[PDB]
Design an enzyme around this catalytic site. Structure first.
Site, PDB file in Angstrom:
ATOM      1  N   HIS A  18       0.744  -1.246   0.000  1.00 51.53           N
ATOM      2  CA  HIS A  18       0.000   0.000   0.000  1.00 51.53           C
ATOM      3  C   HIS A  18       0.784   1.313   0.000  1.00 51.53           C
ATOM      4  O   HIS A  18       0.189   2.383  -0.089  1.00 51.53           O
ATOM      5  CB  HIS A  18      -0.993  -0.013   1.156  1.00 51.53           C
ATOM      6  CG  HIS A  18      -2.321   0.578   0.805  1.00 51.53           C
ATOM      7  ND1 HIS A  18      -3.479   0.257   1.478  1.00 51.53           N
ATOM      8  CD2 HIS A  18      -2.677   1.450  -0.167  1.00 51.53           C
ATOM      9  CE1 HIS A  18      -4.494   0.903   0.931  1.00 51.53           C
ATOM     10  NE2 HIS A  18      -4.033   1.635  -0.067  1.00 51.53           N
ATOM     11  N   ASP A  29      -9.807  -0.518   4.184  1.00 50.41           N
ATOM     12  CA  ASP A  29      -8.659  -1.196   4.773  1.00 50.41           C
ATOM     13  C   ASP A  29      -8.958  -1.578   6.222  1.00 50.41           C
ATOM     14  O   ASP A  29      -9.856  -1.019   6.841  1.00 50.41           O
ATOM     15  CB  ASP A  29      -7.501  -0.198   4.747  1.00 50.41           C
ATOM     16  CG  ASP A  29      -6.166  -0.832   4.953  1.00 50.41           C
ATOM     17  OD1 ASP A  29      -6.035  -1.728   5.818  1.00 50.41           O
ATOM     18  OD2 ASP A  29      -5.240  -0.392   4.247  1.00 50.41           O
ATOM     19  N   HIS A  55      -6.619  -1.271   8.344  1.00 45.96           N
ATOM     20  CA  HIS A  55      -5.741  -0.298   8.975  1.00 45.96           C
ATOM     21  C   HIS A  55      -5.973   1.084   8.384  1.00 45.96           C
ATOM     22  O   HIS A  55      -6.517   1.207   7.295  1.00 45.96           O
ATOM     23  CB  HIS A  55      -4.285  -0.704   8.751  1.00 45.96           C
ATOM     24  CG  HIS A  55      -4.037  -2.173   8.923  1.00 45.96           C
ATOM     25  ND1 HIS A  55      -4.442  -3.107   7.996  1.00 45.96           N
ATOM     26  CD2 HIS A  55      -3.446  -2.869   9.923  1.00 45.96           C
ATOM     27  CE1 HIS A  55      -4.110  -4.316   8.414  1.00 45.96           C
ATOM     28  NE2 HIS A  55      -3.504  -4.196   9.581  1.00 45.96           N
ATOM     29  N   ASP A 101      -3.437   3.254   7.886  1.00 45.61           N
ATOM     30  CA  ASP A 101      -2.202   3.602   7.189  1.00 45.61           C
ATOM     31  C   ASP A 101      -1.852   5.077   7.308  1.00 45.61           C
ATOM     32  O   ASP A 101      -1.312   5.670   6.372  1.00 45.61           O
ATOM     33  CB  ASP A 101      -2.293   3.232   5.710  1.00 45.61           C
ATOM     34  CG  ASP A 101      -2.502   1.746   5.496  1.00 45.61           C
ATOM     35  OD1 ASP A 101      -2.031   0.960   6.348  1.00 45.61           O
ATOM     36  OD2 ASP A 101      -3.122   1.368   4.471  1.00 45.61           O
ATOM     37  N   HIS A 115       4.463   1.202   4.137  1.00 41.23           N
ATOM     38  CA  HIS A 115       3.121   0.880   3.665  1.00 41.23           C
ATOM     39  C   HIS A 115       2.049   1.139   4.718  1.00 41.23           C
ATOM     40  O   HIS A 115       0.869   0.885   4.474  1.00 41.23           O
ATOM     41  CB  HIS A 115       3.040  -0.576   3.191  1.00 41.23           C
ATOM     42  CG  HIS A 115       3.033  -1.581   4.297  1.00 41.23           C
ATOM     43  ND1 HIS A 115       2.682  -2.896   4.096  1.00 41.23           N
ATOM     44  CD2 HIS A 115       3.330  -1.464   5.615  1.00 41.23           C
ATOM     45  CE1 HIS A 115       2.760  -3.550   5.243  1.00 41.23           C
ATOM     46  NE2 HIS A 115       3.150  -2.705   6.179  1.00 41.23           N
ATOM     47  N   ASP A 169      -7.428  -2.128   0.080  1.00 42.52           N
ATOM     48  CA  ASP A 169      -6.439  -3.044   0.655  1.00 42.52           C
ATOM     49  C   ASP A 169      -7.169  -4.375   0.819  1.00 42.52           C
ATOM     50  O   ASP A 169      -8.188  -4.450   1.499  1.00 42.52           O
ATOM     51  CB  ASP A 169      -5.984  -2.540   2.027  1.00 42.52           C
ATOM     52  CG  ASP A 169      -4.773  -3.291   2.560  1.00 42.52           C
ATOM     53  OD1 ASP A 169      -4.731  -4.532   2.424  1.00 42.52           O
ATOM     54  OD2 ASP A 169      -3.866  -2.639   3.129  1.00 42.52           O
ATOM     55  N   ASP A 219      -6.728  -6.733   2.684  1.00 42.66           N
ATOM     56  CA  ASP A 219      -6.882  -7.156   4.078  1.00 42.66           C
ATOM     57  C   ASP A 219      -8.086  -6.549   4.783  1.00 42.66           C
ATOM     58  O   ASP A 219      -8.300  -6.762   5.971  1.00 42.66           O
ATOM     59  CB  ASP A 219      -5.592  -6.926   4.889  1.00 42.66           C
ATOM     60  CG  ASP A 219      -5.237  -5.464   5.071  1.00 42.66           C
ATOM     61  OD1 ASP A 219      -6.137  -4.601   5.039  1.00 42.66           O
ATOM     62  OD2 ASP A 219      -4.033  -5.186   5.269  1.00 42.66           O
ATOM     63  N   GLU A 243      -1.762  -5.170  -1.646  1.00 46.12           N
ATOM     64  CA  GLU A 243      -1.425  -6.136  -0.606  1.00 46.12           C
ATOM     65  C   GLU A 243      -1.740  -7.603  -0.835  1.00 46.12           C
ATOM     66  O   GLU A 243      -1.795  -8.378   0.118  1.00 46.12           O
ATOM     67  CB  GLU A 243      -2.037  -5.689   0.723  1.00 46.12           C
ATOM     68  CG  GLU A 243      -1.519  -4.344   1.228  1.00 46.12           C
ATOM     69  CD  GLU A 243      -0.085  -4.396   1.772  1.00 46.12           C
ATOM     70  OE1 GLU A 243       0.496  -5.496   1.871  1.00 46.12           O
ATOM     71  OE2 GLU A 243       0.461  -3.324   2.118  1.00 46.12           O
TER      72      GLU A 243
HETATM   73  N1  LIG Z   1       0.276  -0.037  12.185  1.00 47.92           N
HETATM   74  C1  LIG Z   1       1.026  -0.841  11.211  1.00 47.92           C
HETATM   75  C2  LIG Z   1       0.310  -0.657   9.903  1.00 47.92           C
HETATM   76  S1  LIG Z   1       0.387  -2.139   8.921  1.00 47.92           S
HETATM   77  C3  LIG Z   1      -0.104  -1.345   7.403  1.00 47.92           C
HETATM   78  C4  LIG Z   1      -0.194  -2.371   6.290  1.00 47.92           C
HETATM   79  B1  LIG Z   1      -1.367  -2.139   5.319  1.00 47.92           B
HETATM   80  O1  LIG Z   1      -0.978  -1.380   4.143  1.00 47.92           O
HETATM   81  O2  LIG Z   1      -1.873  -3.405   4.861  1.00 47.92           O
HETATM   82  O3  LIG Z   1      -2.457  -1.433   5.958  1.00 47.92           O
HETATM   83  C5  LIG Z   1       2.483  -0.373  11.148  1.00 47.92           C
HETATM   84  O4  LIG Z   1       2.842   0.754  10.903  1.00 47.92           O
HETATM   85  O5  LIG Z   1       3.334  -1.384  11.381  1.00 47.92           O
HETATM   86 MN   LIG Z   2      -3.322  -0.561   3.745  1.00 44.66          MN
HETATM   87 MN   LIG Z   3      -4.333  -3.012   5.687  1.00 41.97          MN
END
Ligand SMILES: N[C@@H](CSCC[B-](O)(O)O)C(=O)O
Ligand SMILES: [Mn+2]
Ligand SMILES: [Mn+2]
Ligand SMILES: N[C@@H](CSCC[B-](O)(O)O)C(=O)O
Ligand SMILES: N[C@@H](CSCC[B-](O)(O)O)C(=O)O
Ligand SMILES: [Cl-]
Ligand SMILES: [Cl-]
Ligand SMILES: [Mn+2]
Ligand SMILES: [Mn+2]
Ligand SMILES: [Mn+2]
Ligand SMILES: [Mn+2]
Lengths: 306, 306, 306
Positions: B97, B120, B122, B124, B137, B228, B230, B273
């Site tokens: 992402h 998502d 999250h 992000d 990401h 995303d 996920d 992702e």
């Molecule tokens: N809070 C997590 C975010 S994981 C983000 C991954 B994704 O793009 O899939 O949301 C970190 O900064 O490790």
């Molecule tokens: Mn994401």
């Molecule tokens: Mn995510």
């Protein structure tokens, strides 16, 4: 109440081999003793053996096994009307969904005012005129609706069928893969349906309130439940010919059945398209068969509360 | 309408190896002929090849591959603004992402008034100041929002990035795993979001009514859908780097996409992702890829009722 | 608020081996620091070691390990009433659900006006004279309700137990597998419950509005949440002794927890029946363990919104 069970090992409404074993799979999953367990009085008509039709070729070069399907349904129709006539609630175990031609025709023979609840991922309302495959299990509804007979070519062996129910007496639940022609027919004739999308917005509960409003809102009448196992998500029912993700949940499936039983108007039920051979493993096959049994049991009284 | 497809096999926005194969997996799940089947005019830009950056170490000892990510995104930002420029609805297939930095940058380059729908698990929205992992990401939205500007340390290779949209121009759907700092900033700048709980309490359709009220209630404007994989429950989308239980249902996922299509305002879309290697078996990887195509296909018209 | 954790590695309320490993599994899935992370003040009482009873056979030839279960519960009852006494909200990690005899007795010892929310696939209300298996984890509620004591034979090792709460002070959530005798009892004493069917119909949100109306409608009072992990669907919680399909959804379970936390009346919580050894794989075990922790975390403040 009394229940009759008929096994229809038919598979010529489509090309996949194995749906003819559906009856045996469901039976072996304990359907029968599961029904008496509820208290139902049982009459097993056994598994029917349909008369094949040698050299039954494509009509106009696409409609497959026309007269083979027409003869099997004509036979099934007589057995179903016989059971419904002796006061039994008829449970037919399929093969493919083309069997709905015979069971609904035989049922309508004694309960002209019956309404139909069609639980399926598809609308099975293509006519020999709009089909792309030529497979008759996707055209059942065509030959049964009265407003459509004018756009439904007559096939060899379908002489005996006589369009009975009106387009207002059938409701769909679970649609999620409809062909453009089918969509034209549903809209043009105002046939009521609740696609997975409608279920996502209203909720299975609200969906059943309405389908019953449409069907038995002004009066009590025989209900015919044609349940296609592919109405369930493929993760719940793997053993089937045409899987389509985004289906009914196990609970929703059980809720629909429970709600139909609560009406006290169930006169006939079809459980079709269970194909053991299409399962990746022995367990997948057994999962589907059990799911089938639950739907039937639940349609006749089984409860999640006891 | 016309659709452009850009594959960005980038994986340096995080640490797991495999997201670079995301594009290929989605492609091998029929995306292309699936879009044509809808009637879209396609322009496949192929799979971009980003220029690597040797010796691109941690900034301040935590931010990972800063300049490698900054260069890949710059690069992607041009292909995207090229497509958007020629009137194409830009569809980008991720890697991770962090690519959103480029796609939204390049898209805003021609549609300054674009709004963003971020689906998502999250948010992000961590800055290089608040991140715990250091992976980029999980920081995309930081470099894009103007109100965060001065709370976002400048990294190596990020000079070209200029904050485009305002906090009031983005809406989150599916959140269920939010870090405390992200929650602080989401609350401090009043950014709108619908967590899995909000969806549970409101219903997915009520959720879509509202996000469009916030975003396109007063006027029509280009929509950027950053999706995303996920955001879906791990059982539906196994092949991904950061699963989180209690996610979106297949149906709700499709509902969101359908609703967006219904606005007729979709300009660009990110499907990120998807990591094949992170799948337990061959079928789990295929399941995730197919889900990815259904989301994209659905965003461009595919229907559950034909 | 302050929380106390008590591990009860007891399994003699049933025959499957493995439930005694439930506490360790949950603990090893981060329970403790997860609770600190929330801000809670913890007091770990460690994992209790119950005194075995040699030659503890079937009372009347069916009731299993009577005195062994009676003794284990009496001991747990003291540790619990000890914690509840020092003002702690008591969290018991099970073994089997027979431990609820102890936890609710100990809890009732200080908070006589407590109410009980029983989240389970089963009613666990079989009496020693109605059970079929003889396993005591399916009879906990029998020794606890006051209106039942007249049809509840007194077992060896149960002398100390004294029926506390009334039949109107306990509400079931998630029932989907009730034995005929249990159904008779529920109906006969008007015990309230929301089966999976009631949930499909009213929605988890409405369900909670109602249970709280029944329990704390006229006055605030201590809440005892007895949560059997098998209330969740087998796909979410595989590692358990008595799996039953069509159960709670992860989101629904988390919704129940969040709602109870919102009342601010949680005094003691039971998280039972997690059996790692019944898992098909390492991951299945880990999944169930994590689910257990989430339920506990959520019951004490954890949010899907941050
Ligand atoms: N809070 C997590 C975010 S994981 C983000 C991954 B994704 O793009 O899939 O949301 C970190 O900064 O490790
Ligand atoms: Mn994401
Ligand atoms: Mn995510
Ligand atoms: N539109 C499809 C319908 S597949 C029908 C199969 B079944 O009975 O399962 O709905 C066709 O005509 O090929
Ligand atoms: N009706 C079952 C109840 S199984 C109870 C187990 B558990 O604690 O998980 O509900 C019996 O008495 O065998
Ligand atoms: Cl293809
Ligand atoms: Cl009060
Ligand atoms: Mn069908
Ligand atoms: Mn079908
Ligand atoms: Mn249970
Ligand atoms: Mn229990």
């Amino acid at each position: 109440h009394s229940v009759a069970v008929i096994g229809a090992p038919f598979s010529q409404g489509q090309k996949r081999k194995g749906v003819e074993h559906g009856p045996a799979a469901i039976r072996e999953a304990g359907l029968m003793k599961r029904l008496s367990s509820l208290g139902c009085h049982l009459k097993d008509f056994g598994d029917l053996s349909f008369t094949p039709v040698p050299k039954d070729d494509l009509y106009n070069n696409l409609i497959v096994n026309p007269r083979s399907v027409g003869l099997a349904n004509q036979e099934l129709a007589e057995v179903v009307s016989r059971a419904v006539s002796d006061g039994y609630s008829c449970v037919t175990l399929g093969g493919d969904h083309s069997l709905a031609i015979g069971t609904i025709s035989g049922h309508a023979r004694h309960c002209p005012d019956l309404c139909v609840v069609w639980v399926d991922a598809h609308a099975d309302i293509n006519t020999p005129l709009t089909t792309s495959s030529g497979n008759l299990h996707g055209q059942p509804v065509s030959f049964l609706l009265r407003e459509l007979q004018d756009k439904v070519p007559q096939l060899p062996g379908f002489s005996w069928i006589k369009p009975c129910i009106s387009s207002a007496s059938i409701v769909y639940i679970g649609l999620r893969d409809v062909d453009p022609p089918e969509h034209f027919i549903l809209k043009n004739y105002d046939i009521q349906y609740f696609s997975m999308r409608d279920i996502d917005r209203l909720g299975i509960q609200k969906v059943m309130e309405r389908t019953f409003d449409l069907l038995i809102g002004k009066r009590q009448r025989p209900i015919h439940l044609s349940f296609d196992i592919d109405a369930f998500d493929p993760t719940l029912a793997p053993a089937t010919g045409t899987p389509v993700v985004g289906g009914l949940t196990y609970r929703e499936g059980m809720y629909i059945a429970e709600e139909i039983h609560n009406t006290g108007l169930l006169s006939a039920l079809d459980l079709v398209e269970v194909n053991p051979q299409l399962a990746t493993s022995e367990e997948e096959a057994k999962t589907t068969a059990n799911l089938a049994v639950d739907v039937i049991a639940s349609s006749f009284g089984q409860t999640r509360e006891g």
